[PDB]
Design a protein around this nucleic acid. Structure first.
Lengths: 209, 56, 120, 98, 122, 102, 113
RNA sequence: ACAGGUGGUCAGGUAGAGAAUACCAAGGCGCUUGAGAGAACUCGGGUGAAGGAACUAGGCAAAAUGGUGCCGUAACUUCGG
RNA sequence: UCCUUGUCGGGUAAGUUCCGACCUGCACGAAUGGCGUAAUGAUGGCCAGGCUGUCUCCACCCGAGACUCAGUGAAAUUGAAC
RNA sequence: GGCUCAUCACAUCCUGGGGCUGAAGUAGGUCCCAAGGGUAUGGCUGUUCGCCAUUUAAAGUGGUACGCGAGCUGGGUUUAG
RNA sequence: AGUGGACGCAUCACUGGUGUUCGGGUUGUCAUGCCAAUGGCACUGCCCGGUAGCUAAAUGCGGAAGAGAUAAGUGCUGAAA
């Protein structure tokens, strides 16, 4: 089923009557207005493209302005779509709000996690380092060996080495929703979501049973 | 970490393909004096924004 | 890893940075115009303007706090006397940065950071 | 075992071979001790030995173990026998029979 | 947060005074012991007249950890000194007769109500 | 539900020869349970068997037991009824522990 | 800002103010059996962390020769009533130094005003 | 124009037992490449929840005690320690 | 000292190391000195108390490199290399 | 030999499926298919190996020039005493 | 149907670590003419805390279920015969 695109505000918690702390993540979702609809006849797959938020008029390029003008909607901060679930019909310009998540009870949150820069082996793949003493010289946090001897004579693809951690589009699954309220355009979801405050997030109903 | 062979002319030359300098191509004329200066940089004689700045 | 961190170190320790900015602010006030590199001027606004704001209110307690910085009696005397009244009607932005090309010794970008009017 | 009552599984397999102690190896790699094979018997059994045909133990309490076959003793390699009188240590001692 | 060869205190009148947990239960590469766990300890200091002797290795239940265990409302139960209660080997029944010091309520989920029934403090 | 449950406990505990029954009030001394019932069983299997009866009767009374301890050892067995905790355990070990002073 | 609107709607507005270093009586709800009862708790606060709805304070006692340290959240439904018994007088926001020296030789004084 | 070595003479105040140590007096210097970026990684360090040698060949390195006055100080001994 | 990880006891839960008893002295032995010996030792081995990032398990921070720019400007190696 | 990094094969340690069972149920023994994943910490010795203690469902067997020192360690072998 | 161990992913909302850029206590000394009040140095002079960020020991999630063709095996109809 179709999802939504929102913005990360922060982390808080909601207290229940029995005294249980449920850490929630505040997702701020504007009116997701549909800008394009795709079907088998035109594109071969059923999905509708949606935008969110508003963008300054000067920063809107002319090709983007015409595309938004065709749909009759105003500018948006970004462009996303959600694959249709074979039977749902939507019309260009239809604005979707957070009422669609009032019964999912489980959501999937997708976003670009925080970039940690060019990270080391210890930080990236949770390598635990060597000894810092007992004669060790000039090699403490280094990866160490990178394979076999002459007979392969090469390093295999996908070898765990130094590289950046984060700053990648990653999805966390099966997040329990806590409270939905369209009167403040907020989505309270239990758990921690990828990305920093203010990052654009893609939230969809959970695919896992 | 030492070479084993003599690199050829290309491997040396093709390596410098990305070390070429880039022209600024951002010559700006002051509206008061009319002399060239960089973007957001004061003129050689010391004029900026078209106003009577120190000019020393 | 510097996410949401502010304040450069300029390849110097805390003691050298504090000592430099101690003299950095004093040289600005004494001459009302100061010429240093671009990164140095950026952290200059972080220190010299807070001193000017302390000079807006003339009190014995504030002057001692202003004397605690720049460690110079001339500078604190110059503040609270004309630097206050001149900028009393202005809220922030007590200095401006004008880039002035690059140095011939090390190709560093200098900048003329100076007062708004300099009363000269 | 209190879970079994008969000895049908003893005529079908009559010879129980305890694993021999692993032999010595190079680089002073001492062998592995032979694993203890345990014969599960219903409670209420007597033991009679050919020759000294008497009763050595009575099976009355469940869950208690009896030792009916003492294991052998490991041998010694040349490293255990290295000397300067021979100037060429190459003698070995065989393991005692069980 | 208790690992192997960590010396803990005593929370029963068995006779031991300074016990040291020697192996943590739970599975492969078990990191640390929590607030309610089946821990195995060895006896280093004990009174000569006690029912337990020095050097005997046996099981125990951790009762107090000074880092604290997370309450369901983001709260930890900080203490001063880690302690155990003795246990039998074949059975999980405690050997001690009394329990000394207050005991956290999260031990109920571990079904160790020998300690909870005693120790009227908390 | 204060007085009802112990009377629902005392009647069932006496049906299976629950000897030397004492009704205690630990309100104020302990902040974990409201009251506890102390009783003696003749044999270990007697303690083990009576533990099943109280759990089965409790499960037929709507309330769900909060925990049991009897596992390969019948010297000390207890079950949970929420506010009320009963102690079915051997006489020989009862002298070792406290009585009517907890 | 939009997060701040939710901040006070759940935050409590009847928590008394206590100086770090006071003797406080706190009642805590506990869930067991069928109903909720109150646990009577007394101690001296050694550290206060008052930030938003998650404002916290750390309390400590000496019980049976054992020092027990406790952390609450001021705006949680678990706590029921907080009262100040004896007012202390210390000039440190954090009082983690109570761990080392014994409580008997570290008796606090009256703030006396 | 080198982190090395090279004999003698003069030897301030404060705190200190002092030619050690920390600051300063007269005096001499900032050591002939720098400006930024605040990544992996290396070097010199600071701190650390819980454990306290479980790492290792080995407490290697680190960590720790460290002064004054008083009380008191075992086995052994050549009677001095 | 081939049998020596000899047998037994102590230390640790667990001790091929260590300490003490048994002699089967291959190849101890009396100035190429034998047996003990207080004190001494940047000497070999073992254990205990405190201590700690040595480690479980690493994280953060401070400086010099590493990185970009400007100025100067090396070497081992090299039959030729698509 | 140890630390770090792993890769491949199944002659499979467990997990998974089945046949026989000499398979009452639990617990097993053998064989077949199956490599997707995981497969321990400590005292001793340099330990590879191994003994013992204590865990797990398991602490698998091999190749990889018995892997990996232009990654580390120099404990063993170790020139010169 | 719940709860755990290891592993990976994400986050600082909780409990904490760091946080030499924040405040405070204090020793020796020098300086600002002096008292008072401040600043420098002595590892940040030595310590007590602690915002933001980062981080785990902190807390959220995943190992699926299902579909198609199969190995060993269990089958149905079924001639060669």
């Amino acid at each position: 089923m179709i999802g939504l695109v929102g913005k990360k505000v922060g982390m808080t918690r909601i207290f229940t009557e029995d005294g249980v702390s449920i850490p929630v993540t505040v997702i701020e979702v504007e009116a997701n207005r549909v800008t394009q609809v795709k079907d088998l006849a035109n594109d071969g797959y059923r999905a509708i493209q949606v935008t969110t938020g508003a963008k300054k008029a000067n920063r809107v390029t002319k090709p983007e302005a015409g595309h938004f003008a065709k749909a009759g909607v105003e500018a948006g901060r970004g462009l996303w779509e959600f694959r249709l679930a074979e039977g749902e019909e939507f019309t260009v310009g239809q604005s979707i709000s957070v009422e669609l998540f009032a019964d999912v009870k489980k959501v999937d949150v997708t976003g670009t996690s925080k970039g940690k820069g060019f990270a080391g082996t210890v930080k990236r793949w949770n390598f635990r380092t060597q000894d810092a003493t007992h004669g060790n010289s000039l090699s403490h946090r280094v990866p160490g060996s990178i394979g076999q001897n002459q007979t392969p004579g090469k390093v295999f693809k996908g070898k765990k080495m130094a590289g950046q951690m984060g700053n990648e589009r990653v999805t966390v699954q099966s997040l329990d929703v806590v409270r939905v309220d369209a009167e403040r355009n907020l989505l309270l979801v239990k758990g921690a979501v990828p990305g920093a405050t203010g990052s654009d997030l893609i939230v969809k109903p959970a695919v896992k049973a | 970490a030492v070479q084993q062979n003599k690199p050829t002319r290309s491997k040396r030359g093709m390596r410098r393909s990305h070390d070429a300098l880039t022209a600024v191509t951002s010559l700006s004329v002051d509206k008061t004096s009319g002399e060239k200066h960089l973007r957001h940089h004061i003129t050689a004689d010391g004029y900026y924004r078209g106003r009577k700045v120190i000019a020393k | 890893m510097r996410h949401r961190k502010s304040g450069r170190q300029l390849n110097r320790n805390s003691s050298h940075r504090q000592a430099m900015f101690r003299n950095m602010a004093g040289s600005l006030v004494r001459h009302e115009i100061i010429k240093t590199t671009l990164p140095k001027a950026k952290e200059l606004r972080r220190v010299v303007e807070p001193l000017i704001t302390l000079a807006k209110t003339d009190s014995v307690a504030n002057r001692r706090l202003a004397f605690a910085r720049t460690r110079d009696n001339e500078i604190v005397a110059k503040l609270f006397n004309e630097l206050g009244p001149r900028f009393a009607s202005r809220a922030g932005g007590y200095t401006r940065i004008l880039k002035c090309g690059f140095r011939a010794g090390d190709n560093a970008p200098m900048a003329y950071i100076e007062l708004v009017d300099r009363s000269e | 075992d209190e879970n079994l009552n008969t000895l049908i599984d003893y005529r079908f397999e009559k010879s129980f071979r305890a694993e021999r102690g692993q032999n010595g190896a190079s680089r002073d790699c001492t062998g592995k001790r032979g694993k203890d094979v345990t014969i599960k018997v219903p409670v209420g059994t007597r033991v009679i030995d050919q020759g000294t045909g008497e009763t050595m133990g009575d099976m009355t309490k469940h869950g208690q173990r009896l030792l009916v076959a003492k294991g052998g003793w490991h041998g010694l390699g040349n490293t255990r026998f290295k000397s300067s009188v021979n100037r060429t240590p190459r003698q070995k001692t065989n393991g005692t029979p069980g | 947060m208790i690992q192997e060869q960590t010396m803990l205190n005593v929370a029963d009148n068995s006779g031991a005074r300074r016990v040291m947990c020697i192996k943590v239960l739970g599975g492969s590469h078990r990191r640390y012991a929590g607030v309610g766990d089946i821990i195995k300890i060895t006896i280093k200091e004990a009174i000569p007249r006690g029912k337990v002797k020095k050097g005997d290795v046996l099981k125990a239940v951790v009762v107090r950890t000074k880092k604290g265990v997370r309450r369901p409302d983001g709260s930890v139960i900080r203490f001063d000194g880690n302690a155990c209660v003795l246990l039998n080997n074949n059975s999980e029944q405690p050997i001690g007769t009394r329990i000394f010091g207050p005991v956290t309520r999260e031990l109920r989920s571990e079904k160790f109500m020998k300690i909870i029934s005693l120790a009227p403090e908390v | 539900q204060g007085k009802a449950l112990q009377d629902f406990v005392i009647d069932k505990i006496d049906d299976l020869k629950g000897q030397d029954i004492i009704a205690l009030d630990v309100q104020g001394k302990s902040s974990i349970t409201d009251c506890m019932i102390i009783c003696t069983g003749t044999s270990s299997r007697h303690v083990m068997s009576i533990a099943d009866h109280v759990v089965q009767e409790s499960r037929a009374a709507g309330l769900l037991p909060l925990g049991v301890e009897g596992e390969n050892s019948a010297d000390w067995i207890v079950v949970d009824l929420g506010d009320v905790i009963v102690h079915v355990m051997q006489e020989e070990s009862r002298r070792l522990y406290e009585l009517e002073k907890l | 800002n939009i997060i701040k609107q939710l901040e006070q709607e759940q935050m409590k507005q009847d928590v008394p103010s206590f100086r770090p270093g006071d003797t406080v009586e706190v009642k805590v709800w506990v869930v067991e059996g069928s109903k909720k009862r109150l646990q009577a708790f007394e101690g001296v606060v050694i550290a206060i962390r008052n930030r938003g709805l998650h404002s916290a304070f750390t309390v400590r006692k000496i019980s049976n020769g054992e020092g027990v340290e406790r952390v609450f959240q001021t705006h949680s439904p678990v706590v029921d009533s907080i009262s100040v018994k004896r007012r202390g007088a210390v000039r440190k926001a954090k009082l983690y130094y109570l761990r080392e020296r014994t409580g008997k030789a570290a008796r606090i004084k009256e703030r006396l005003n």
